[PDB]
DNA sequence: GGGGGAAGGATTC
DNA sequence: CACGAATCCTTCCCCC
């Protein structure tokens, strides 16, 4: 099996660059402004020019501006990036018939048939790279290997605007030399748990008793890491189906006042419904981000679909449940709809 | 003992 | 100061 992973470079920022080419070469910082105060919010993404100075996703817009006061700061336009993304996916869709659109800027292609051997895969990568740059002016990094994980890891090492193949010989090398933190799906929480177990490399996961591993990072994560360390990971390429739709907004000020929160919650619901399509959810969750940035939620599954009126009403009950069962003030509030009919 | 949901939280990208 | 969604997990519960 040959997997070709495609990852659009600094996507949001690059799109803004495509929509306004005079931006090229300048530090471009796409931000999600929260509205709690001038420049409150975080950086969603930044082009590499901004990144080489530490301005990256997750840092507050205020910290980025102190580092790069003259960069171009743009409000994130999710809808625009999604439409652009959809076009690129369609473009890729004609290269493989087997595609897994992992997110707005990532997709895996099972080109096991379309190609044979990594030379032809590599060449196909360039075909895809040139095609995307041609029709959309979007540079992407391509990762190629035997499975999604290493295909993704290949892209991680080749970005930006690169292409890399990780042959079966290197797979083995990385299995014992790649920091396990750099393995997809292993975040800081898991990375630390593995460090405390003596696992710093994928192969080290073979030094632990499975049940001890399972006990520490969960069975699913244990079997995942083990399979990769044995060079046996082989999950198929298949785009998952949207299982939930929601929206969560940040309030101007933290609150515990029902009437003060409702408007935000209702706006969340309204946008969530517009997003749903003709899709009808049977489950609804009200999600709140507490003042200490903790996330709490209360939901309910109905035996039928949820009309907007029912949503408006149940969400208020769920929000009252949250306030009733958690003392903290609420910073962000929203809803998530799932279990579509 | 354990299937099968549902619920609330943990994690990751 | 810090802004959508999938899986996975663990807990609880109904119940055969
Ligand atoms: N809003 C937001 N989007 C992020 C963040 N990190 C990554 N992304 C998205 C941006 C898009 C995709 C690739 O870049 O990942 C983040 O911290 N905030
Ligand atoms: Ca990515
Ligand atoms: Ca990317
Ligand atoms: Ca990591």
Which CATH number goes with the domain that contains A49?
Answer: 3.40.1170.60
Helices assigned H by DSSP within A5-107: 11-19, 48-51, 61-67, 78-93
- Domain shared by A49 and A119, yes or no: no
**DSSP notation for A246-271:** EEEEEEEEEE--HHHHHHHHHHHHHH
Distance CA A86, CA A14 (A): 15
CA dihedral A32, A34, A38, A39 (to 10 degrees): -30
- As ranges, strand B nucleotides with an atom below 7 A of a protein CB are 5-13
- Domain shared by A82 and A219, yes or no: no
And the tokens for A25?
């070469």
By three-state DSSP, how is residue A32 classified?
A: strand
Task: Give the end of a domain, one of A143, A166, A189.
Answer: A166
Distance CA A139, CA A152 (A): 16
Closest nucleotide to A325 by C1' from CA: B8
CA A310, distance to chain mean position in Å, is 30
Distance CA A12, CA A44 (A): 8
Could you give the strand order of the β-sheet that contains A330-340, starting from the edge strand earlier in sequence? A244-255, A330-340, A281-290, A295-301
- Domain shared by A204 and A287, yes or no: no
Over the range A242-254, which residues count as b (16 or more CB within 10 Å of their CB) and which as e?
A: eeebbbbbbbeeb
Distance CA A111, CA A104 (A): 20
With distances taken from each CA to the C1' atom of nucleotide C7, the closest residue turns out to be A220
H or E element: which one contains A2? none
Backbone angles phi, psi at A286, to 5 degrees: -105, 125
- Domain shared by A72 and A206, yes or no: no
Question: For residue A116, what are the domain limits?
Answer: 2-10+78-166
Task: Flag whether A203 is in a domain.
Answer: yes
CATH number of the domain at A223, please: 1.10.150.20
Asked if A19 and A42 touch (Cβ cutoff 8 Å), the reply is no
Could you give the strand order of the β-sheet that contains A163-165, starting from the edge strand earlier in sequence? A99-103, A106-110, A3-8, A140-145, A163-165
DSSP A235: P
- Domain shared by A22 and A119, yes or no: no
DSSP A69: T
Distance CA A7, CA A166 (A): 16
Nearest CA-CA partner of A324 in A284, A288, A272, A283: A288
- Domain shared by A68 and A158, yes or no: no
And the tokens for A188?
């800081």
Atom 2 of ligand 1, nearest CA residue: A44
With tokens 């790069």, the residue in question is A68
Long-range pairs for A77-80: beta carbons < 8 A, 24 or more residues apart: A77/A12, A77/A16, A80/A15, A80/A19
- Domain shared by A225 and A187, yes or no: yes
Asked if A297 and A265 touch (Cβ cutoff 8 Å), the reply is no
Partnered with residue A28 across adjacent β-strands are: A72
With tokens 């929000």, the residue in question is A319
In sequence order, what are the residues at sequence separation of 6 or more whose Cβ sits closer than 8 angstroms to the Cβ of residue A116?
none
Distance CA A97, CA A257 (A): 51
Distance CA A151, CA A142 (A): 8
Asked if A32 CB < 7 A from strand C, the reply is yes
CA dihedral A9, A11, A17, A18 (to 10 degrees): 90
Task: Flag whether A227 is in a domain.
Answer: yes
Partnered with residue A141 across adjacent β-strands are: A7
Protein CA at A65 to nucleotide C1' at C16, angstroms? 63
In sequence order, what are the residues at sequence separation of 6 or more whose Cβ sits closer than 8 angstroms to the Cβ of residue A134?
none
- Domain shared by A318 and A263, yes or no: yes
Ligand 1 closest atom vs CA A32: 1
- Domain shared by A6 and A112, yes or no: yes
CATH number of the domain at A150, please: 3.30.70.270
Query: No. of H helices and E strands in chain A?
Result: 12, 12
Whether the CB of A105 sits within 6 Å of ligand 1: yes
* Domain count across chain A: 4
Asked if A9 and A139 touch (Cβ cutoff 8 Å), the reply is yes
- Domain shared by A91 and A219, yes or no: no
Q: Solved by what technique?
A: X-ray
With tokens 């004609």, the residue in question is A94
H or E element: which one contains A78? helix A78-93
| Burial environment of residue A48 by CB neighbours within 10 A (0 to 12, 13 to 18, 19 or more) | middle
DSSP A187: -
| Site to substitute for ligand 1 among A7, A14, A45, A293, most atoms within 8 A of C-beta | A45
How many other C-beta atoms can be found within 10 angstroms of the C-beta atom of residue A82? 13
- Domain shared by A190 and A55, yes or no: no
Task: Give the end of a domain, one of A123, A151, A166.
Answer: A166
By three-state DSSP, how is residue A3 classified?
A: strand
Distance CA A88, CA A150 (A): 22
In sequence order, what are the residues at sequence separation of 6 or more whose Cβ sits closer than 8 angstroms to the Cβ of residue A72?
A23, A26, A27, A28, A29
Strands annotated E in A113-160: 140-145
Q: What share of chain A is helix, strand, coil (3-state, %, to 5)?
A: 45, 25, 30
Distance CA A27, CA A37 (A): 23
Whether the CB of A11 sits within 6 Å of ligand 1: yes
Asked if A251 and A264 touch (Cβ cutoff 8 Å), the reply is yes
């Amino acid at each position: 099996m040959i997997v070709l992973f495609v990852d659009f470079d600094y996507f949001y920022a690059q799109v803004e660059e495509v929509l306004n080419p005079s931006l090229k070469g300048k530090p471009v910082v796409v931000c999600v402004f929260s509205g709690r105060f001038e420049d409150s919010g975080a950086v969603a993404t930044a082009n590499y020019e901004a990144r080489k100075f530490g301005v990256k996703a997750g840092i507050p817009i205020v910290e980025a501006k102190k580092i790069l006061p003259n960069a171009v700061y743009l409000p994130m336009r999710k809808e625009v990036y999604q439409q652009v993304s959809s076009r690129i996916m369609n473009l890729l869709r004609e290269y493989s018939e087997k595609i897994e659109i992992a997110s707005i800027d990532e997709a895996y292609l099972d080109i096991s048939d379309k190609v044979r051997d990594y030379r032809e895969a590599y060449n196909l990568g360039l075909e895809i790279k040139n095609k995307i740059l041609e029709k959309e002016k979007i540079t992407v990094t391509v990762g190629i290997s035997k499975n999604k994980v290493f295909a993704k890891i290949a892209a991680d090492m080749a970005k930006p605007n690169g292409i890399k193949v990780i042959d079966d010989e290197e797979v083995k090398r990385l299995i014992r030399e790649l920091d396990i933190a750099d393995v997809p799906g292993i975040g800081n929480i898991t990375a630390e748990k593995l460090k405390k177990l003596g696992i710093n490399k994928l192969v080290d996961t073979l030094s632990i008793e499975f049940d001890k591993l399972k006990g520490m990072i969960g069975e699913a994560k244990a079997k995942y890491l083990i399979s990769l360390a044995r060079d046996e990971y082989n999950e198929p390429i298949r785009t998952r189906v949207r299982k939930s739709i929601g929206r969560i907004v940040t309030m101007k000020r933290n609150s515990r006042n029902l009437e003060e929160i409702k408007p935000y919650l209702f706006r969340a619901i309204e946008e969530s419904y517009y997003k749903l399509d003709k899709r009808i959810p049977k489950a609804i969750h009200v999600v709140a981000v507490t003042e200490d940035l903790d996330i709490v939620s209360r939901g309910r599954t109905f035996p039928h679909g949820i009309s907007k009126e029912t949503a408006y009403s149940e969400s208020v009950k769920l929000l009252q449940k949250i306030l009733e069962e958690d003392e903290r003030k609420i910073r962000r509030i929203g809803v998530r709809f799932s279990k579509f009919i």
